[PDB]
Design a protein around this ligand. Structure first.
Ligand code: CHL
Ligand code: CHL
Ligand code: CLA
Ligand code: CLA
Ligand code: CLA
Ligand code: CLA
Ligand code: CLA
Ligand code: CLA
Ligand SMILES: CCCCCCCCCCCCCCCC(=O)OC[C@H](COP(=O)(O)OC[C@@H](O)CO)OC(=O)CCCCCCCCCCCCCCC
Ligand SMILES: CC1=C[C@H](O)CC(C)(C)[C@H]1/C=C/C(C)=C/C=C/C(C)=C/C=C/C=C(C)/C=C/C=C(C)/C=C/C1=C(C)C[C@H](O)CC1(C)C
Lengths: 100, 191, 130, 129, 478, 116, 48, 176
């Protein structure tokens, strides 16, 4: 059930990754769930590049690039978090709607 | 209230789970009649909730419907099939005898206790975890049971009537039938 | 799913020449060969007797593939780029093929809740480069 | 030369064998004979060391021929069929060892069994039909 | 070992120089790099001038692209950046923020957009949208002491992460169902030798791609993120986004939807239509009720105007792409003009809301005139350019059968005339006791003047001189 | 790259090791210590209360520059493995790669980021 | 039956927009969670 | 290379059941530090999923770049969000909880019924030439090693400037 049971867990993570995103209240939790979604897509990707495409790996390289960009985004978002917590002394996300 | 705008029949002042002012025939005038009705109600609820998925899920598999699953007993040499497998004791007098002694004895064990509250909510060995810990939650726990149980009974009525209207049918088979053309497959076509 | 409708002709060929591996047949060689590079052909695939299950004309631009690196049916890559004992098809050439079931998908179908190709089939092609 | 009969592929191995319950006698007689001309196509893929399909195909064709051989053999000529059961032992131990000699990839034993695994399977299906 | 990146290698050289000068030089930079970056941009434009009338030759190991149509957009993004930088110099100058890394960010985002215009690789066309988005949450929030500039970083980063996520998940579904393939051209083969094309699957990897595409160029059902960010970020980066993001997204969309999606036409032609019919409606109604200038521009010039561009992508038999190129060339100018005017007036006064533009015709008439011209052009009136843009967009798009999209377009254009004429009316006035003490103290009066005046006449002349532009735009096969 | 079965057995064994040690300690242990047990040590003051002890302002920059400069290595490893296998083009490519981040580190050094 | 009917119509065709704009403009309105919710609803329904 | 045998599905189900609880801990628990630690658990148990399938690099790297740098960075970040212990009891927040738990389940149902209709084990037979090459004699750190630089030249050349720009932006933003 290798090729079949893992994909059955991709969605069962991806979905959760979205839900925690929407119902998130603090910035760090939203970023965590974002990273979780990216890892879900990564996992949905890799298995495809193990059943087939073994002559020239086309998924593992793409997985590497996805992880690199995930790290970059997780750096930039937290950097923005620093400045927002500097401006206002609380990072409650859903209590800032002064741009509407 | 069930019918917003009518006064409560004096003998329905909450004081019970799943009680919304509905006693048009005054069946519950006598408190003794009142209490026994609660027993039959929860039981008719309790059995029904078990029976509905047991009617449906087999149809959701290759197994026959709730009507076909009783048919081998009609023929004299009937042998059952559980999950398609011909269980040896599937002959009618076999299961009937097993059914009779077990059903009567356990149901007689009911008839020989009079709390009478436990006759609705025994718990204990019937509550291996003890959800009854929070009396607030347990009281709402009855509500969920009552409303779901009442929901089950209606679904049971729908299943049976759809069978008389459509002999040899399945509730999911009926559901899909409507699902083809909802506007030309309805309860409109019966009468 | 399974077969659908179409309509066309075939420009009846000569007798096929199997050449020990497949079924080869030539209709019109015109201009020039093609190396191990991207090509752009137009196909119309049949079943063994009569049926047609796809045709590049049933869409827009005829599809583009790679002739020289294994990315297609071995039968085609043998009968378009030129196999052992067979001359390759020119730029504007036109050939006809009958693919045996060993140089094809083989004895198992491609299912999608209904196999889109009969299990252990052997199909036909009318391949025209472009 | 018309089309053929798919005959119950169609699933994702969680629909089949778990959720679409059905297997009739003489229908497993199709799977059994199919994994004979089926498993006789890995010879080129054993020539070149493609150690990644010679495992997936073997696992699938086994888990398919590890239930049919128990259903089909019930439906062969039952008066005289101890041999039709005295073959499943071989036709499912040769493969159980084939699956060993691919896990830690060998060549000599792998190919020495990739002939003595099909040589038997042409005899299990033989007692069927 | 290849000159097809040299148009971008020059940009990389300029990037490295801009990063170096701050490391080495002390203080001689402020007006120096202001033109040193323009040197790199104009040199890249000259380099792209060479490859006019070229071959469809494939890239490094067949990675990004090199044909005529893609080269058009590759030059167009450079044009946008060249016009935009002089705006986003003096603005951030008058905020006492570091200017070096701002120009570095703008340059790197332009580089990402340029690489995106090709990218027939399924991976490059994924990193490049990130190279364009990772350099976007920075600019769109690069005023830290402000408060709104943080809201328009939260509700831009979260959204642009979720959307790129959905897009890459669609990409993974495609890579799976396609038997394993990345090269954009080589999918309809590989999706056939693997016979799983007509099956469910592909139907999912089409929607999970189209949604991530839409978010990047914001049609109606996903427009939610645009009105906020465009108000929260500084006006120059608003203009930069609202031009180059749309150009790059519309350049990537046509290629990602036409090359690997031959078969699914009748199932995405409809889909995009559902977006367009909404994009040109919900992006206009709200535009009426606005009182802020940047937010009204977000609604009108983007929420809507990203409608009739698409209005031919659905109706395209390669006889229309010329009209998309022409309309993009018109829209870039007719949008950068009004953004230049808005930046100039806002800096000179210090307000954004509409109710302060009163009387501006009397104090300084040149700016009022050069803003009214661009606004009317956006309205699409006959002698201007937007009229001929919308016209040739409809005349090829009514010539392709579909009727219930041109009528809606004309109707919503008539509707859009309203707020344009509203602000125009607010310009021309002389009721001295009405004008607020904002235009009353306006010392009227290089770079921004030059940009505004050379960008506004290109909003009136090409609409009448579209003959050579049309003759040029017809040679696009991609 | 032949048999990681030893790896899997070592994983399960060394993951059972800590819970095994904890359980073995728990079996032969004292059911005692109902004392205060609500205060940790090296604080003979019986103190309690306090928060907002972060100083994340300094160490956060270190964490960020590390997170960014780390990705270099997992890209260098496929290159560091494929030097002689391929020609010398990968040499120049990886030189450009590493030099980009050398310039980045020079920048992070000049402008005050790596501090006390 | 001129001001009250056809003038009424030619204004209500230009007045109903003034109401619909501000009406649909006051749903959501910030609260990024609501943005993502309304962004997921359309993605989900479009799968049909 | 290959796997032991019928021990495979055991580890498969074990890791799946661990990862489900991990995700539920990520999304349910209110204390953010517990959430981050459960996220780390999720990521190590998915690195083990990557390692089970015979893809070695994309497993160990994923373990180094995420279970390391990113998690410690997030731990440092949670030292800046003060105020926890919000409401509880069955969708603590507003009805938005129910609306999400509805639409997400619709999304699930859609994809989770789309998947078990594609014969993956039949989509593997149609490609018997892709994973049939192995280049002749290679191991799986050289496969990636070369095929990253022989045809994936442009994105590898690109990612570096993305990293540099992200570094510069992060330092310029986080610093007051
Ligand atoms: C089970 C018997 C039952 C029957 C025959 C009806 C019958 C009716 N209900 Mg009803 N209801 C019933 C139970 C309930 N209703 C309601 C809630 C409502 C509402 C809100 C309304 C009705 C209304 C009506 C009407 C129709 C006569 C409608 C009504 O009152 O019209 C007069 C109506 O608005 N019912 C609840 C939840 C409190 C019930 C639970 O037992
Ligand atoms: C076989 C002998 C038998 C005996 C001694 C009883 C016992 C009783 N049942 Mg009964 N039942 C019996 C057959 C069955 N009951 C039921 C289900 C029910 C229900 C739903 C109810 C009874 C009720 C009663 C009454 C009486 C005490 C009523 C009751 O207990 O009210 C106090 C009542 O409501 N029984 C089923 C189907 C599962 C039976 C099939 O054999
Ligand atoms: C046989 C099953 C059964 C039984 C014994 C009861 C019994 C009871 N129900 Mg009840 N109920 C049932 C089925 C049943 N119900 C179903 C199927 C529904 C859904 C339509 C409801 C909906 C319902 C509501 C909405 C309410 C009750 C209430 C009551 C109580 C007072 C009414 C009464 O005396 O009814 C006695 C009923 C019978 C003796 C059954 C007679 C059957 C007739 C003769 C044939 C038709 C009583 C304990 C009220 C109450 O106080 O809650 C506890 C109340 O508010 N029930
Ligand atoms: C409401 C009606 C009802 C009830 C309460 C039961 C109750 C029961 N049935 Mg049953 N059954 C029923 C209707 C019913 N049956 C019908 C209509 C059929 C189809 C003819 C069957 C066919 C059937 C089989 C084949 C077996 C049971 C068995 C059983 C018992 C299972 C638990 C057990 O003893 O161990 C239980 C006493 C099992 C049994 O004998 O228990 C040992 C077996 N049942
Ligand atoms: C009071 C409740 C109740 C009753 C009387 C029945 C009665 C019956 N069920 Mg059933 N079932 C129920 C609840 C019930 N079900 C529930 C709640 C489920 C969900 C798990 C099922 C799931 C189910 C399946 C999957 C099957 C049955 C079957 C059957 C029939 C054969 C029973 C048998 O072989 O021996 C009794 C069995 C055991 C004691 C074990 C019988 C009529 C079989 C059928 O469809 O008959 C053709 C069958 O294959 N049941
Ligand atoms: C969703 C349906 C549902 C719900 C919410 C409950 C809820 C409850 N049941 Mg229950 N029950 C159900 C279906 C349900 N039941 C069915 C189908 C049967 C058969 C039973 C049989 C049953 C028994 C035999 C007992 C309960 C008890 C209880 C209570 C404590 C547990 C609680 C009120 C116990 C109770 O009253 O606890 C004190 C108890 O004794 N129920
Ligand atoms: C539109 C009005 C409305 C409102 C305000 C409610 C409110 C409620 N319903 Mg409800 N319900 C409604 C319509 C409504 N329902 C309808 C139309 C049906 C028929 C399908 C139901 C069927 C229903 C059931 C079957 C149950 C509820 C339950 C509940 C309660 C649990 C809520 C929760 O999240 O638990 C936390 C809550 C008081 C539960 C309950 O028992 O209430 C305590 C329960 O089990 N509802
Ligand atoms: C309990 C809920 C419930 C649900 C979801 C359904 C659902 C359905 N019923 Mg149904 N039915 C029910 C109860 C229910 N029934 C009950 C209690 C009865 C007995 C009166 C019936 C009697 C009945 C008949 C006689 C027929 C249906 C039919 C149908 C199907 C057509 C659409 C429809 O609803 O018809 C309308 C159903 C009703 C108005 C019943 C009342 C529903 C209330 C709200 C409960 C549909 C699948 C028809 C069918 O199979 O289509 C081909 C059909 O011929 N039903
Ligand atoms: C045959 C010709 C066609 C006519 C078909 C019937 C037409 C009328 C159907 C509408 C009835 C609505 C009753 C609402 C009554 C209603 O459902 O209240 C709503 C109730 C949920 O109420 P709550 O507890 O949530 O109340 C709190 C809030 O909802 C505020 O009230 O649902 C239940 O009662 C579940 C318990 C099972 C009991 C369900 C009762 C259903 C009764 C319907 C029986 C009709 C039989 C007719 C047979 C012919
Ligand atoms: C007591 C106790 C104690 C301890 O402590 C713990 C424990 C153990 C946990 C517990 C137990 C519990 C239980 C057993 C429960 C059960 C329940 C149920 C079964 C319910 C149902 C319930 C059920 C229900 C509601 C149902 C419903 C149904 C319905 C609506 C249906 C509908 C339909 C459809 C769709 C369609 C078609 O065409 C028709 C019809 C058919 C009409």
């Amino acid at each position: 059930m290798m090729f079949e049971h893992v994909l059955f867990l991709s969605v069962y993570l991806f979905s959760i990754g979205i839900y925690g995103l929407i119902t998130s209240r603090n910035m760090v939790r939203a970023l965590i769930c974002l990273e979780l979604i990216l890892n879900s897509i990564n996992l949905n990707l890799v298995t495809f590049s193990d059943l087939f495409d073994s002559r020239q790996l086309k998924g593992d390289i793409f997985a590497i690039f996805v992880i690199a960009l995930a790290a970059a985004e997780a750096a930039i978002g937290l950097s923005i978090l620093s400045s927002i917590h500097r401006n206002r002394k609380s990072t409650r996300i859903n209590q800032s709607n002064l741009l509407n | 209230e069930w019918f917003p705008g009518q006064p409560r029949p004096a003998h329905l002042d909450g004081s019970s789970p799943g009680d919304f002012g509905f006693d048009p025939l005054g069946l519950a005038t006598v408190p003794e009649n009142f209490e026994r009705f609660k027993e039959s109600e929860i039981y008719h609820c309790r059995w029904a909730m078990l029976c509905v998925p047991g009617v449906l899920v087999p149809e959701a598999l290759g197994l026959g419907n709730w009507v076909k699953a009783q048919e081998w007993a009609a023929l004299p040499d009937g042998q059952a099939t559980y999950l398609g497998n011909p269980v040896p004791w599937g002959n009618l007098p076999t299961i009937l005898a097993i059914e009779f002694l077990a059903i009567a004895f356990a149901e007689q064990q009911r008839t020989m206790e009079k709390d009478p509250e436990k006759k609705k909510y025994p718990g204990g060995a019937f509550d291996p975890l003890g959800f009854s810990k929070d009396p607030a939650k347990f009281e709402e726990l009855k509500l969920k049971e009552i409303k779901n149980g009442r929901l089950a009974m209606l679904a049971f009525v729908g299943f049976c009537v759809q069978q008389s209207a459509y002999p040899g049918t399945g509730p999911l088979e009926n559901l899909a039938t409507h699902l083809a053309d909802p506007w030309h497959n309805n309860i409109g076509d019966i009468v | 799913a399974r077969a659908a409708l179409e309509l066309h002709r075939s420009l009846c060929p000569l007798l096929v020449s199997p050449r020990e591996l497949e079924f080869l047949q030539v209709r019109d060689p015109s201009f020039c060969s093609v190396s191990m590079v991207v090509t752009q052909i137009h196909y119309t695939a049949r079943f063994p007797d009569g049926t047609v299950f796809d045709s590049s004309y049933k869409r827009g631009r005829p599809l583009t593939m790679r002739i020289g690196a294994g990315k297609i049916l071995r039968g085609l890559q043998q009968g378009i780029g030129g196999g052992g004992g067979v001359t390759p098809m020119l730029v504007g050439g036109k050939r006809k093929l009958m693919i045996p079931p060993i140089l094809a998908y083989g004895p198992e179908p491609a299912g999608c809740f209904s196999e889109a190709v009969f299990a252990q089939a052997e199909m036909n092609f009318c391949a025209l480069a472009a | 030369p018309p089309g053929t009969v798919p005959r119950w592929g169609t699933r994702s191995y969680v629909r089949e064998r778990f959720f679409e319950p059905g297997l009739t006698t003489e229908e497993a007689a199709a799977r059994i004979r199919q994994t004979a001309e089926g498993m006789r196509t890995l010879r080129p893929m054993l020539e070149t060391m493609s150690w990644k399909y010679v495992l997936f195909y073997v696992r699938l064709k086994s888990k398919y021929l590890d239930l049919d051989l128990t259903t089909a053999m019930a439906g062969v000529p039952e008066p005289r069929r101890p041999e039709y059961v005295l073959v499943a032992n071989e036709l499912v131990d040769n493969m159980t060892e084939f699956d060993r000699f691919v896990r830690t990839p060998k060549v000599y034993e792998s190919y020495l069994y990739y002939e003595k695994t099909l040589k038997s399977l042409d005899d299990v299906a033989e007692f069927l039909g | 070992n290849g000159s097809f990146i040299f148009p971008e290698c020059i940009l990389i050289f300029g990037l490295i120089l801009l990063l170096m000068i701050d490391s080495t030089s002390d203080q001689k930079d402020r007006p120096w790099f202001y033109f040193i970056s323009s040197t790199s941009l104009v040199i890249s434009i000259t380099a792209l001038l060479f490859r006019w009338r070229e071959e469809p030759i494939i890239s490094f190991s067949g990675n990004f692209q090199t044909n005529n149509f893609n080269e058009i957009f590759q030059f167009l993004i450079l044009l946008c950046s060249t016009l935009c930088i002089p705006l986003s110099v003096e603005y951030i100058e008058c905020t006492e923020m570091a200017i070096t890394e701002f120009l570095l960010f703008v340059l790197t985002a332009t580089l990402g957009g340029m690489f995106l215009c090709g990218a027939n690789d399924l991976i490059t066309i994924f990193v490049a949208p990130e190279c364009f988005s990772l350099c976007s949450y920075l600019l769109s929030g690069y005023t830290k002491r402000d408060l709104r500039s943080n809201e328009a970083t939260m509700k831009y980063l979260l959204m642009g992460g979720a959307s790129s996520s959905i897009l890459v998940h669609g990409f993974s579904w495609l890579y799976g169902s396609s038997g394993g393939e990345i090269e954009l051209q080589e999918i309809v083969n590989g999706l056939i030798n693997t016979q799983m094309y007509n099956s469910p699957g592909i139907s999912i990897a089409l929607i999970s791609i189209t949604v991530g595409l839409g978010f990047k160029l914001s049609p109606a059902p996903f427009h939610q993120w645009t009105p906020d960010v465009y108000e929260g970020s500084p006006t120059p980066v608003v203009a930069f986004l609202s031009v180059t993001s749309k150009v790059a997204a519309s350049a990537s969309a046509t290629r990602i939807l036409d090359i690997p999606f031959y078969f699914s036409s009748n199932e995405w032609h409809l889909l995009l239509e559902i977006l367009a019919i909404l994009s040109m409606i919900l992006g206009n109604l709200l535009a009426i009720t606005q009182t802020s200038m940047k937010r009204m521009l977000a609604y009108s010039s983007i929420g809507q105007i990203g409608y009739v561009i698409i209005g031919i992508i659905v109706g395209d038999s390669n006889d229309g792409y010329a009209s998309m190129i022409t309309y993009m060339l018109f829209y870039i100018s007719m949008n950068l003009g009004t953004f230049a005017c808005i930046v100039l007036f806002g800096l000179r006064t210090g307000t954004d809301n509409i109710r302060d533009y009163a009387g501006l015709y009397m104090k300084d008439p040149f700016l009022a005139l050069s803003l009214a011209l661009c606004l009317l052009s956006l309205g699409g009136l006959p002698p201007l350019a937007g009229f001929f843009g919308k016209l040739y967009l409809f005349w090829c798009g009514w010539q392709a059968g579909l009727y219930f999209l041109v009528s809606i377009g004309l109707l919503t254009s008539v509707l859009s005339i309203y707020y344009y004429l509203k602000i125009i009316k607010l310009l021309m006035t002389g009721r001295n006791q009405e004008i607020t003490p904002y235009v009353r103290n306006y010392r009227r009066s290089n770079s921004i003047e030059l940009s505004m005046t050379v960008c506004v006449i290109a909003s009136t002349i090409p609409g009448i001189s579209m003959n050579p532009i049309l003759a040029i735009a017809q040679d696009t096969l991609f | 790259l032949h048999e990681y079965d030893i790896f899997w057995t070592f994983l399960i064994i060394a993951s059972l090791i800590p819970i095994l040690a904890f359980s073995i300690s728990g079996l032969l242990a004292p059911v005692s210590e109902g004392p205060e047990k609500l205060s940790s040590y090296e604080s003979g003051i019986e103190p309690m209360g306090g928060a907002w002890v972060q100083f994340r302002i300094r160490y956060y920059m270190f964490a960020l520059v590390f997170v960014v400069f780390d990705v270099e290595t997992v890209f260098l490893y496929p290159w560091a493995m494929s030097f002689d296998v391929l020609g010398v083009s990968v040499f120049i490519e990886a030189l450009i790669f590493v030099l980009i981040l050398v310039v980045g580190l020079v920048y992070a050094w000049r402008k005050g980021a790596l501090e006390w | 039956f001129d001001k009250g009917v056809i003038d009424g119509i030619t204004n209500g065709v230009g007045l109903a927009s003034f109401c619909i704009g501000e009406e649909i403009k006051y749903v959501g309105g910030g609260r990024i969670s609501s943005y993502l919710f309304f962004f997921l609803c359309y993605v989900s329904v479009f799968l049909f | 290379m290959d796997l032991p045998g019928p021990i495979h599905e055991i580890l498969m189900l074990f890791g799946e059941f661990i990862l489900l609880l991990g995700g539920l801990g990520v999304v349910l628990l209110t204390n953010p530090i517990y959430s981050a630690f459960s996220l780390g658990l999720v990521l190590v148990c998915i690195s083990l999923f990557y390692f089970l399938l015979n893809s070695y690099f994309v497993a160990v790297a994923q373990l180094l770049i995420y279970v390391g740098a990113i998690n410690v960075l997030i731990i440092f970040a949670v030292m800046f969000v003060n105020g926890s212990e919000w409401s509880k009891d069955k969708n603590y927040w507003t009805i938005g909880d129910g609306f999400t738990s509805l639409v997400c389940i619709t999304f699930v149902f859609s994809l989770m019924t789309t998947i078990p209709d594609t014969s993956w084990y039949g989509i593997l037979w149609t490609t018997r030439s892709n994973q049939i090459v192995e280049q002749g004699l290679i191991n799986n750190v050289q496969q990636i090693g070369i095929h990253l630089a022989t045809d994936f030249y442009l994105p590898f050349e690109l990612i570096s400037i993305i990293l540099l720009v992200s570094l510069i932006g992060a330092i310029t933003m986080a610093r007051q």
